[PDB]
Subunit: 187 residues, 2 copies
């Protein structure tokens, strides 16, 4: 019944913030999720956490000693994932990358979209579930999109990512450019 | 640009009907999609096509001679797919099975949900896009759910499937159980 949600090894802002955000969505719907991380938080992500007054996810090396099932955000390939990923069931994946080095024994909820950031997809999922995005969660989701898009300069950034960042900046109460440049400079 | 939408080799009713239904949705949304099939239509599927006045999708052996990109419904595993799947880009997958024998070079729209039929997922996609399901298309979608669920008897059947079947039967103008028994008998 408890599940862990995490992104990839060598975490980036999307991998930390999308784990926290998806755990919030799961918990606001009555489930039992803890967001965790697989490595050290970098200076860009730490700026986001500090700014929006959010705790760092707990660091884990393995999952099977804790839970039976996990959710992956921002990755799918086994070599990017937790070291004992073969010993737990992947219940869901929310991601924006190519699929490789990944198989399941059972059906699952797999949601990949060809957008520039996982948090763009989570924005969609909050709205599909009629769950309000709290100011600080919006700030973390905005941070993820700024990070993965290089402040909207990456060709991986789509109109969906820009539209999500506009929504989330309004919710978070920040100017995306001013906040984004400070966040990126902290990294 | 033209795309082909298809389900698996040895087609079943979900693989035919979900290809037709998702091509309808795509086309309503301004794309250029043709549903195709990879083998012969069985008698159960033929009943559904005849009842709802739909033509059997065109049979193909290969896709790369026609298009650059394809959408898979009701499958992902390469050995279930078209023989030259590695020569085209997989743009999207809509499915309800485990993931295996499947990789992509690029990102894509991958939507798997742990439900009993692809058409239950497509029903959500119509509603997400505010596109009306025409009577005949609802009939094919209902046929897919009855087929995959064995008239709601299969261990894979969920409450999401049962609910979608009732909705689609109302739109199609049939009684799900009465129509479904005749369709199943035809196979
Ligand atoms: Mn990442
Ligand atoms: Mn990312
Ligand atoms: Mn099938
Ligand atoms: Mn199916």
């Amino acid at each position: 019944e408890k599940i862990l949600i995490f992104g990839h090894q060598n975490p980036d802002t999307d991998t930390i913030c999308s784990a926290i955000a998806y755990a919030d969505l799961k918990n606001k719907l009555g489930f039992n999720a803890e967001p965790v991380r697989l490595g050290q938080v970098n200076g860009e992500t730490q700026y986001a956490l500090d700014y929006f007054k959010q705790e760092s996810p707990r660091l884990v090396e393995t999952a099977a000693n804790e839970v039976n099932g996990v959710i992956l955000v921002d990755h799918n390939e086994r070599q990017q994932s937790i070291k004992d990923i073969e010993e737990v069931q992947v219940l869901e994946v929310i991601d924006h990358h190519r699929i490789a080095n990944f198989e399941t024994a059972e059906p699952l909820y797999y949601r990949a979209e060809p957008v520039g950031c996982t948090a763009t997809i989570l924005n969609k999922m909050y709205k599909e579930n009629n769950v309000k995005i709290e100011k600080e969660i919006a700030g973390l989701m905005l941070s993820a999109i700024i990070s993965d898009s290089l402040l909207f300069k990456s060709p991986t950034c789509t109109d969906q990512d820009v539209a999500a960042a506009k929504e989330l900046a309004e919710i978070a109460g920040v100017d995306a450019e001013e906040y984004g440049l400070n966040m990126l400079k902290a990294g």
